[PDB]
Enzyme design. Structure first.
Site, PDB file in Angstrom:
ATOM      1  N   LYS A  64     -14.499 -35.354  -2.126  1.00  0.00           N
ATOM      2  CA  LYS A  64     -14.991 -35.774  -3.424  1.00  0.00           C
ATOM      3  C   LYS A  64     -16.334 -36.476  -3.345  1.00  0.00           C
ATOM      4  O   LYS A  64     -17.036 -36.556  -4.356  1.00  0.00           O
ATOM      5  CB  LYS A  64     -13.971 -36.694  -4.078  1.00  0.00           C
ATOM      6  CG  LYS A  64     -12.678 -36.002  -4.429  1.00  0.00           C
ATOM      7  CD  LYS A  64     -11.576 -36.990  -4.692  1.00  0.00           C
ATOM      8  CE  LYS A  64     -10.299 -36.298  -5.083  1.00  0.00           C
ATOM      9  NZ  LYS A  64      -9.109 -36.999  -4.555  1.00  0.00           N
ATOM     10  N   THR A  78      -6.199 -39.178  -8.225  1.00  0.00           N
ATOM     11  CA  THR A  78      -7.177 -39.452  -7.145  1.00  0.00           C
ATOM     12  C   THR A  78      -7.636 -40.889  -7.227  1.00  0.00           C
ATOM     13  O   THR A  78      -7.406 -41.564  -8.223  1.00  0.00           O
ATOM     14  CB  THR A  78      -8.390 -38.508  -7.223  1.00  0.00           C
ATOM     15  OG1 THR A  78      -9.376 -38.918  -6.272  1.00  0.00           O
ATOM     16  CG2 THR A  78      -9.004 -38.502  -8.612  1.00  0.00           C
ATOM     17  N   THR A  79      -8.259 -41.358  -6.155  1.00  0.00           N
ATOM     18  CA  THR A  79      -8.780 -42.710  -6.084  1.00  0.00           C
ATOM     19  C   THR A  79     -10.164 -42.655  -5.469  1.00  0.00           C
ATOM     20  O   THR A  79     -10.341 -42.103  -4.381  1.00  0.00           O
ATOM     21  CB  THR A  79      -7.877 -43.609  -5.253  1.00  0.00           C
ATOM     22  OG1 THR A  79      -6.529 -43.485  -5.711  1.00  0.00           O
ATOM     23  CG2 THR A  79      -8.292 -45.040  -5.399  1.00  0.00           C
TER      24      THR A  79
END
Lengths: 222, 250, 204, 197, 243, 240, 202, 229, 238
Positions: free
Chosen positions: G33, G1-2
């Protein structure tokens, strides 16, 4: 195991297979992988079957308490939070992967719960061994705001794909339809595969088997 | 806090435990109960104090409180403490059975419960168990047995006894009438009806007032049978006939 | 396989107003037999039986704990237990030990005391109830007796056919595995009576 | 390593044990007593890992004699067997597992003689004859051959001597002498120790 | 009638009549504070008013207040011992946040008052600990039910009310209100505020100024609990005095 | 009355007399005052010197419960020290968890609840001390809170505790602290203490002063002796 | 993820992808997120989804209680400190990397980064997750003091797209948030809305 | 932590005076009544409120423990709420264990065990309430009464609260085993009317029935329809 | 009347706790002792009481650490308990920080431990009064302790029976004590303690114990043998 759920316009449709396997041999051909949490909330379970059953029973108990204490119907987020907190407390050792669905005052809500305590609110989810095939069917043919018949046919096609392409899943399709006003629990919704008729009769006549002892005990009745 | 405490678990200047003395006094008020040993069996008999017409009958017995395959216990005193003690007894017996895989002896069961009762007497600063309860049962070691218990935590083995109201009069009747080693279950039933009629304030035993249960061995399997209303009706009828025949003679 | 240490096999079958339950007799270490009179079927009621296979110590311990809870239930309630209720109790008992489990796979079989309706079930290592309408198995030769029962079994069988079926199944199954055999005992349950028969089987 | 053997009969139980206590290559003792009496008419034979044996045996002995003093009557062999089985089974899950291989023997006035068997996993069993140790593999076939439920005690001692002499000829370890004692209605009776020079 | 035996008056145990004299003394402790509060719900709004008596000029009027904020959408007014009041509002805040953490949604006022009443029950049942000499009044908006008003007491009574009063003038205030609700009314926001202020002013004879009182509200349009400023209070008061 | 022997009881008129009896004690103690102003807060104490033997700085009635907040007490000095320990623990735990200096309002609330726990149960007596906390933060500003044994906490522009609470309150009421600043406030604080001090009943006193404000960069501290002497001189001269 | 965060004058910008993976299979392609701890305080979540959700809920609980009892709006430093003590006390069990951002009146827009191990660092711009590796250089080059709201939003979108194309774990639709005194403006970039960068295309 | 000595202790007569006094409070409690018909069982009580200001729908003296069990009380409301909460927990414990709805008999046994636990335990007073419990199990109705002592009795019909002696006399006069619940409701409402001391309405009382369907408290509308007679 | 007195958790209607006053009265009965200091030295002087002529006199003065010493009064069991606590505190200090514990912090801990029991049911005050004496980086200190957990800081102090004579003597002669030699200081304290004695009795080597601490000198108790030099030059009773 293949369980799947979807949100239609005015409720939720859940679906699942009925094949329970100990290893790679079938043990139960008509299992119920759809559990009762509340009158308005239902859940389907995959993974460790005992963990799923006992967890669903526990949360059903706690929600029965909560609901009849409050005097109003239980919510879905409550169940999701109970489950995720429990599963996180046990840190994934109880292998209960759940798809949870229910209708409440705010609207239809569907959750997918993983053993380590993760959750995701989705319009469609699939879990178990046939989850990938069911996801394929949904990513292909899902559209928002489907009618009930369309959603039922979609979920049936998805569970069927998981059946006819995964070894673990099979034997039947179960459906549950929750809405604002009704609940339709359809246990034999479809029978895609049946056992073929036995060509030869192998019934054994009396005396076929030897016996070294016999002891009859009468049971009193009244 | 010292001010608000009853201080139950203390001696008295005379050397008494006033709390268990008072519990015995309370048992004196309770509905009378008795049990009679015989060569072939043993029977409990009780006066069902709850004799109101509206009361239903949704239980096997009002007081008999079966504990095990091979024993049971009638009650005198507080029904709540009785229920608790019966639960403890059942747990004890099933624990012995889990351990040894044999049914518990009655003496051991009674000793366990009496130790539990004594503990409330000695420490904890809690009130005693204001319950005296008979025990009946069968063990291979000594056969048919009858035991009595008091709130003090002391027990005794009796051939026949009564607890509850008018227990003294019951015992005075039982001493003369009971025949050591010369009793059968029928004769014991008759004697029970006799002392119940003598001891109870009711002019006649309606057969709603009384509750009787018997313990016997049939084909190596003991049975605990509560006698039905027809049976006890026939018994009181026979007793009234015998009393009339005795009176008619003189 | 800790389950294969003692071996053993247990099976149940359903019929018209009747159930049958059967189990082998061998008590043995992983290859050495000790006794041919082992009790793997224990009576939990007048016409309700439970059958346990797996580690023998856990078999005995589970049966004892279950009789404990069951006698307490029958005393408190004043009635005989229903089979579904016993199933649930067994599942709770096994799940109490979900870490460090009792290595046994029970099988329960009986008639409902009121309606005399057949009931059979099986539970996993950790208490996963599995009700069926035809048959249930537990043991090392499960894979064998599954197919054997799938073939021989027929619906609404009477007690005679039920006995011949379960006998043929158990014999032809345990003959084909090593660690089970040394005879087999068959309890038949019906409303009026209980019938128990031992079968002539290869003691090899 | 250690060897135990038990032979039930109509009116008696016969039990034997090797008298060897060995730590390693060396044999420390040649008169070790592996038989513990829990009461006048029941014996407990215990073998396995060192220390666990005597600890467990003495615990069971304590509990049995305590039952006697408290209640006035001794336990039956069946009750003693289930008691020791419970105590052993509770412990295998616990942090203190007792690795002991047992063989119990007793006589009841009502139920007659009895011989029980339980492994370190605490799986109980009632058998007409039983044995423990690597020697059991050799000697069990002897008993299955020559055993009858109507066997007299002289014949039982003879059968025992057959099993032990087969051990002497065919078993790698040195088990020169064996303790012997009989249980019956009269009580436990010690016999002449079977020796092989 | 009012017999006594043992330590019935000193601790929470039953008198010969079963009255539990102690909790009654706790009820007197509420009036010992010397203030009064009033609550009333309308179709679309609920309010709570109470006196704001500053005995000394030196006291910061900002700090002293019996109106508290349990949550964003809940507010309460406490009457009685100030210390027990603060303890109860802290416990209520705890229960609200724990309810949110467990069950995933904002607690209803009825469940909150029930929890608080159960807590007060464990006090009045156990002898070690005295009942808290305070009574809580809660207001909130329930999505299904609408505006809600509930009152707790030391005993554990947790009823729901169309309108309520608490303090030394409770009986006079409820006598005043029972007449108003007996008559039909629309019960809008301004009408509710006027009714509450009139009840308080009539029972006290105070003829309040702006600082003399404090008020809090919840509206279906703005469900968040808001304690009105002196300007809004004076605006309402000037309207009242004119009509 | 038998209703006065425990704080788990109630008077028939609703009063817990143990708490009232406790605050009698602090009313039987030498007085202390704290006066809030724009720049910050100032504290002052009439520390009666019991004997010529005791050393300067003995029985210090001014504590530092944290660097940004001060404390001034009356009543039983033992219970005062105990509550100072409690306050320091609360402040430390708050800093450790939430990462910043505790607000004085929250600190007073926590301390008051800890006090209030004691007046309920019979196992424990009420505290015998009433005390003032004072702090200054650039965001929160000057803040002063007085606490009583009952567990009631209120903010004050000026507070007093002890025997001469009433006369102290009057002399403070004629002060108009809101415009003033600390360097001026210290002087009339000394004035008020010198006034309320009873020369006949109280043999002698040692003035204990403490302040906090922007001048200290938000650090509660005892007054430098130069300013202490200047204020004492002004007070004695004005006293006539 | 980023996950990515940037501080602008008077607020902050939060950006994150919508992909969470179990192995090479995407269980959820639209996960959010970005989590609101409070009305003006947000949290991005990297690592174990379970751990991050749990600590987020607990911090939300504690911070709501703290804010309501104080009767003043909470601080981002406070929320970050809570996350810090939790993740440090349970650093062994939790595989979680957090970045906290919000607005408060005392300090304004703030960004704090709580990586694995429970250390707390205030940063002008802070990236996290498996894909932050691939864009450290892009943010080092592209960043400039004094960027505005729209400028920072475009910066974050470009960075997340660059990370998403390269990283298999990162992907999906970009979810963005901007937090300030006024409130929260959330938006979702999908498909053509996402910035595109030309391949080598030999 | 807490006192560890019993506040209830034997008098020289032998009576637990705290228990007698708790029963006195129950006697001063509001009227309540139960009638066991063949097809069902009805529970009723008066909900008389001090003022119109009180909201009737806010609180219910009739509370369901499960789908098929519900109970009513006379005495102390907070104590009643403690008991009903613990009873719900007990019933759902039974359901977790056995996956079968608890029998009302076992339920009342357990709650009576609790009520015993309090009178014997230290630093506590007895529960100042008595309960009426109704159930439908095994296609049979039940009605039980649990006293403060912790003793459970079974009744075909009974009353509690003020004027319970006269109410029980009236009920013994008017009770028939063959009655259906439709007539049982009328008899119960009449019994409450004997001691209501007012013009009873849908708000002034509360009622609930148990049957094969389960336990439900009747809404004011159908309560009014029954009150029409 | 007996109410308000039997327990420590009971405030009197006059705002007092009688049990604390009673514990203080317990100290007022104990053996007399003196503590005084100068720029460089701190002294603890004690009258050791003997139950009988044959009995050896009680150990009033104790060691806590090299830099701290105490003199007790009242219940010696409570005294030894507190002394064990203080010894453990100072040992923990040296174990942790490798430094001598300051006297002020030590008495703070003592006051805390002494305050906890007087606020709880079924516990009694420590019925003991102490005089602390030590040398730290700051300098000599003398702290008084009471059953009431409040402590004091003082240039000189005396606690025990007939201590008031000693207190007035010390108040009169406080001026000189600051600048004095060790012999002069201990002689002053000895005269002060001499005032406490009955007129019949007189100070002896047997009935006197001295504890001295200073910059270089660690805490040293001078028993009957080595106490004679300090009292060798003392004047007679007036």
């Amino acid at each position: 195991t293949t369980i799947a759920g979807v949100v239609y316009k005015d409720g939720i449709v859940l679906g699942a297979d009925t094949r329970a396997t100990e290893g790679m041999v079938v043990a139960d051909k008509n299992c119920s992988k759809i559990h009762f949490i509340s009158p308005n909330i239902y859940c389907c379970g995959a993974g460790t079957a005992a963990d799923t059953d006992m967890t669903t029973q526990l949360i059903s108990s706690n929600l029965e308490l909560h609901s009849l204490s409050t005097g109003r119907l239980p919510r879905v987020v409550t169940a999701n939070r109970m489950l995720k907190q429990m599963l996180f407390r046990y840190q994934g050792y109880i292998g209960a992967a759940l798809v949870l669905g229910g209708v409440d005052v705010t609207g239809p809500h569907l959750y997918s719960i993983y053993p380590h305590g993760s959750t995701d609110k989705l319009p469609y989810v699939t879990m178990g061994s046939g989850s990938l095939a069911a996801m394929a069917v949904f990513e292909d043919k899902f559209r928002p705001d489907m009618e009930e018949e369309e959603a039922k046919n979609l979920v049936s096609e998805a569970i069927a794909a998981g059946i006819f392409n995964d070894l673990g899943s099979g034997s039947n399709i179960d459906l549950c339809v929750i809405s604002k006003n009704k609940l339709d629990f359809l246990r034999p919704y479809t029978v895609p595969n049946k056992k073929g008729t036995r060509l030869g009769r192998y019934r054994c006549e009396k005396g076929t088997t030897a016996v070294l002892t016999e002891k009859i005990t009468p049971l009193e009745i009244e | 806090s010292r001010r608000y405490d009853s201080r139950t678990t203390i001696f008295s200047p005379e050397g008494r435990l006033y709390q268990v003395e008072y519990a015995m006094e309370a048992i004196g008020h309770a509905g009378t109960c008795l049990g009679i040993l015989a060569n072939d069996g043993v029977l409990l008999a009780a006066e069902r104090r709850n004799i109101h017409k509206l009361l239903d009958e949704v239980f096997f017995s009002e007081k008999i409180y079966k504990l095990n395959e091979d024993m049971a216990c009638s009650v005198a005193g507080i029904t709540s403490d009785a229920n608790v003690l019966t639960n403890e007894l059942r747990l004890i017996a099933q624990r012995y059975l889990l351990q040894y895989q044999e049914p518990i002896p009655c003496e051991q069961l009674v000793t366990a419960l009496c130790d539990i009762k004594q503990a409330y007497t000695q420490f904890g600063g809690k009130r005693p168990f204001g319950v005296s309860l008979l025990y009946i049962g069968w063990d291979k070691h000594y056969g048919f047995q009858l035991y009595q218990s008091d709130p003090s935590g002391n027990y005794g083995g009796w051939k026949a006894t009564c607890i509850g109201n008018n227990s003294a009069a019951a015992v005075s009747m039982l001493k003369q009438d009971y025949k050591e080693g010369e009793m059968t279950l029928k004769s014991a039933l008759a004697l029970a009806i006799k002392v119940l009629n003598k001891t109870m304030d009711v002019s006649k035993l309606s057969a709603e007032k009384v509750e009787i249960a018997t313990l016997t061995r049939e084909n190596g399997k003991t049975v605990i049978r509560v006698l039905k209303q027809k049976e006890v009706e026939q018994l009181i009828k026979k007793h009234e006939e015998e009393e009339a025949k005795a009176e008619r003679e003189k | 396989s800790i389950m294969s240490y003692n071996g053993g096999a247990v099976m149940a079958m359903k019929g018209k107003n009747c159930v049958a339950i059967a189990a082998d007799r061998r008590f043995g270490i992983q290859a050495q037999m000790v006794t041919t009179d082992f009790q793997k079927i224990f009576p939990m009621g007048d016409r309700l039986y439970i059958g346990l296979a797996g580690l023998a110590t856990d078999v005995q311990t589970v049966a004892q704990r279950l009789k404990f809870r069951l006698n307490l239930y029958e005393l408190k309630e004043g009635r005989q237990i229903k089979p579904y209720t016993l199933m649930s109790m067994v599942a709770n008992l096994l799940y109490e030990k979900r870490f460090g489990p009792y290595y046994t796979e029970p099988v329960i079989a009986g008639l409902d005391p009121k309606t005399f309706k057949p009931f059979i079930c099986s539970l996993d290592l950790i208490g996963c109830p599995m009700v069926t309408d035809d048959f249930v198995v537990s043991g090392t030769c499960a894979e064998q007796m599954y197919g054997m029962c799938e073939s021989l079994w027929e619906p609404n069988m009477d007690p005679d056919h039920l006995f011949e079926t379960i006998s043929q199944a158990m014999l032809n199954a345990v003959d084909r595995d090593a660690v089970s055999g040394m005879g087999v005992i068959v309890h038949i349950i019906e409303k009026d009576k209980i019938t128990t028969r031992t079968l002539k089987a290869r003691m090899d | 390593m250690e060897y135990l053997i038990g032979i039930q009969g109509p009116d008696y139980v016969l039990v034997a044990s090797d008298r060897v206590a060995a730590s390693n290559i060396v044999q420390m003792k040649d008169d070790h007593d592996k038989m513990f009496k829990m009461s006048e008419k029941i014996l407990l034979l215990c073998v396995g890992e060192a220390g666990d044996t005597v600890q467990f045996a003495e615990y069971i002995q304590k509990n049995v004699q305590l039952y006697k003093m408290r209640n006035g009557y001794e336990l039956s062999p069946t009750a003693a067997a289930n008691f020791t089985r419970r105590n052993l089974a509770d412990c295998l899950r616990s942090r203190t597992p007792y690795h002991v291989n047992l063989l119990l023997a007793g006589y009841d006035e009502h139920e007659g003689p009895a011989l029980y068997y339980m492994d370190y996993l605490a799986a109980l069993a009632k058998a007409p004859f039983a044995a423990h140790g690597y020697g059991a593999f050799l000697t069990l076939s002897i008993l299955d051959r020559y055993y009858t439920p109507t066997i007299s005690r002289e014949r039982a001692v003879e059968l025992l001597r057959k099993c032990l002499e087969e051990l002497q000829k065919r078993f790698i370890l040195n088990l020169p002498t064996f303790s012997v004692r009989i249980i019956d209605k009269n009580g436990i009776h010690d016999l002449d120790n079977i020796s092989f020079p | 009638r009012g017999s006594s035996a043992g330590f019935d008056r000193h601790i929470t145990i039953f008198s010969p009549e079963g009255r539990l004299y102690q909790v009654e003394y706790a009820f007197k402790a509420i009036n010992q504070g010397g203030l009064t509060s009033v609550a009333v719900r309308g179709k679309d709004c609920a309010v709570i008013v109470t006196q704001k008596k500053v005995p000394d000029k030196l006291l910061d009027s900002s700090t002293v207040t019996h109106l508290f904020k349990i949550t964003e959408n809940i507010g309460c007014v406490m009457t009685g011992m100030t210390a027990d009041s603060r303890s109860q509002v802290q416990r209520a805040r705890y229960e609200a946040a724990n309810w949110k953490y467990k069950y995933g949604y904002e607690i209803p006022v009825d469940m909150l008052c029930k929890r608080i009443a159960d807590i007060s029950q464990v006090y009045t049942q156990n002898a070690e600990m005295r009942p808290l000499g305070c009574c809580m009044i809660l207001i909130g908006i329930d999505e299904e039910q609408g505006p809600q008003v509930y009152k707790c007491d030391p005993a554990g009574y947790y009823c729901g009310f169309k309108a309520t009063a608490a303090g030394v003038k409770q009986t006079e205030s409820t006598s005043f209100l029972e007449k108003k609700v007996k008559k039909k009314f629309d019960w809008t926001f301004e009408q509710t505020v006027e009714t509450a202020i009139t009840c308080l002013s009539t029972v006290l004879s105070i003829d309040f100024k702006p600082s003399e009182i404090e008020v809090g509200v919840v509206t279906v349009e703005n469900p968040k609990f808001r304690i009105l400023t002196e300007a809004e209070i004076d605006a309402h008061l000037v309207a009242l005095a004119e009509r | 009355t038998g209703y006065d022997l425990s704080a788990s009881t109630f008077s028939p008129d609703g009063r817990v007399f143990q708490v009232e009896y406790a605050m009698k004690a602090v009313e039987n103690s030498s007085t202390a005052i704290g006066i809030r102003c724009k720049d910050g807060v100032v504290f002052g104490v009439e520390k009666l010197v019991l004997s010529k033997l005791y050393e300067e700085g003995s029985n210090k009635r001014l504590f530092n419960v944290d660097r940004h907040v001060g404390m001034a007490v009356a009543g039983l000095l033992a219970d005062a020290r105990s509550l100072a320990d409690i306050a320091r623990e609360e402040a430390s735990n708050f800093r450790s968890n939430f990462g910043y200096n505790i607000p004085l309002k929250h600190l007073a609330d926590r301390v008051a609840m800890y006090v209030h726990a004691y007046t309920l149960y019979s196992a424990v007596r009420p505290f015998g001390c009433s005390f003032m906390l004072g702090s200054y933060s650039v965001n929160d500003g000057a803040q002063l809170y007085m606490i009583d044994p009952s567990g009631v906490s209120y903010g004050y522009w000026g507070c007093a505790i002890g025997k001469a609470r009433q006369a102290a309150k009057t002399e403070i009421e004629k002060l108009q602290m809101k415009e003033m600043t600390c360097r001026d406030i210290v002087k009339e604080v000394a004035k008020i203490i010198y006034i309320v001090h009873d020369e006949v009943k109280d043999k002698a006193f040692e003035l204990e002063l403490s302040w906090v404000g922007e001048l200290t960069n938000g650090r509660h501290e005892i007054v430098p002796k130069d300013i202490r002497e200047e204020a004492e001189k002004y007070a004695k001269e004005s006293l006539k | 993820t980023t996950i990515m965060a940037v501080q602008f004058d008077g607020g902050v910008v939060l950006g994150a992808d919508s992909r969470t993976t179990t192995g090479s299979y995407i269980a959820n392609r639209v996960t959010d997120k970005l989590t609101p701890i409070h009305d003006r305080i947000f949290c991005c979540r990297s690592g174990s989804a379970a751990d991050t959700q749990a600590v987020a809920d607990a911090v939300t609980y504690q911070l709501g209680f703290h804010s309501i009892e104080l009767n003043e709006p909470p601080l981002v430093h406070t929320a970050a400190s809570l996350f810090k003590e939790m993740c440090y006390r349970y650093r062994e069990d939790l595989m979680a990397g957090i970045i906290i951002a919000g607005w408060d009146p005392q300090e304004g827009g703030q960004v704090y980064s709580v990586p694995m191990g429970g250390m707390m660092v205030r940063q002008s711009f802070a990236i996290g997750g498996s894909g932050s590796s691939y864009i450290y250089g892009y943010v080092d080059a592209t960043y400039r003091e004094g960027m505005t709201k729209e400028e920072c939003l475009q910066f974050t979108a470009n960075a997340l797209a660059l990370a998403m194309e390269r990283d298999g774990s990162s992907g999906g639709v970009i979810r963005l948030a901007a937090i300030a005194e006024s409130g929260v403006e959330r938006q979702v970039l999908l498909g053509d809305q996402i910035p595109k960068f030309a391949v080598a295309t030999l | 932590r807490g006192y560890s000595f019993s506040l209830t202790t034997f008098s020289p007569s032998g009576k637990l005076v705290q228990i007698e006094y708790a029963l006195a409070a129950v006697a001063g409690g509001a009227p309540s009544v139960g009638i066991k018909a063949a097809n069902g069982v009805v529970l009723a009580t008066e909900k008389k409120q001090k003022s119109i200001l009180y909201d009737e729908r806010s609180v219910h003296k009739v509370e369901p423990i499960t789908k098929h069990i519900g109970l009513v009380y006379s005495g102390m409301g907070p104590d009643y709420r403690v008991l009903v909460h613990r009873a719900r927990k007990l019933a759902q414990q039974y359901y977790l264990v056995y996956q079968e709805p608890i029998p009302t008999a076992q339920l009342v046994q357990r709650v009576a065990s609790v009520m015993q636990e309090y009178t014997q335990s230290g630093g506590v007073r007895p529960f100042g309430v008595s309960l009426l419990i109704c159930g439908w199990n095994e296609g049979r109705p039940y009605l039980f009464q649990s006293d403060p002592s912790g003793a459970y009795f079974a009744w075909k019909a009974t009353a509690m609260g003020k004027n319970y002696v006269n109410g029980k006399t009236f009920l013994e006069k008017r009770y028939n085993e063959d009655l259906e619940l439709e007539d049982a409701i009328h008899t119960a409402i009449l019994t409450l009317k004997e001691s209501f001391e007012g013009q009873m309405t849908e708000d002034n009382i509360e009622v609930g029935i148990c049957n094969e369907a389960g336990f439900r408290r009747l809404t004011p509308t159908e309560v009014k329809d029954y009150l029409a007679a | 009347r007996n109410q308000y007195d039997n327990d420590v958790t009971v405030w009197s209607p006059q705002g007092r706790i009688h049990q604390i006053e009673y514990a203080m009265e317990a100290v007022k009965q104990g053996s007399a002792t003196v503590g005084l200091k100068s720029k460089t030295h701190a002294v603890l002087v004690a009258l050791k009481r003997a139950q009988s002529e044959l009995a050896a006199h009680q150990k009033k003065i104790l060691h806590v650490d090299n830099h701290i010493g105490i003199s007790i009064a009242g219940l010696t069991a409570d005294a030894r308990l507190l002394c064990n606590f203080m010894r453990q505190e100072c040992l923990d200090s040296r174990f942790v920080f490798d430094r001598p514990l300051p006297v002020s912090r030590l008495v703070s801990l003592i006051g805390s431990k002494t305050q906890i029991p007087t606020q709880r049911y079924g516990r009694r005050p420590y019925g003991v009064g102490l005089l602390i004496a030590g040398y730290d980086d700051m300098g000599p200190h003398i702290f008084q302790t009471c059953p009431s957990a409040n402590y004091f800081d003082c240039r000189a102090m005396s606690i025990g029976a007939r201590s008031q004579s000693a207190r007035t003597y010390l108040e009169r002669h406080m001026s000189e004590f600051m600048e004095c030699n060790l012999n002069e200081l201990v002689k002053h304290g000895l005269r002060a303690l001499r005032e406490t004695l009955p007129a019949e009795q007189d100070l002896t080597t047997k009935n006197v114990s001295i504890g001295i601490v200073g910059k270089d000198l660690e805490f040293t108790i001078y028993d009957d043998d080595d106490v004679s030099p300090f009292l060798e030059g003392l004047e007679e009773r007036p």
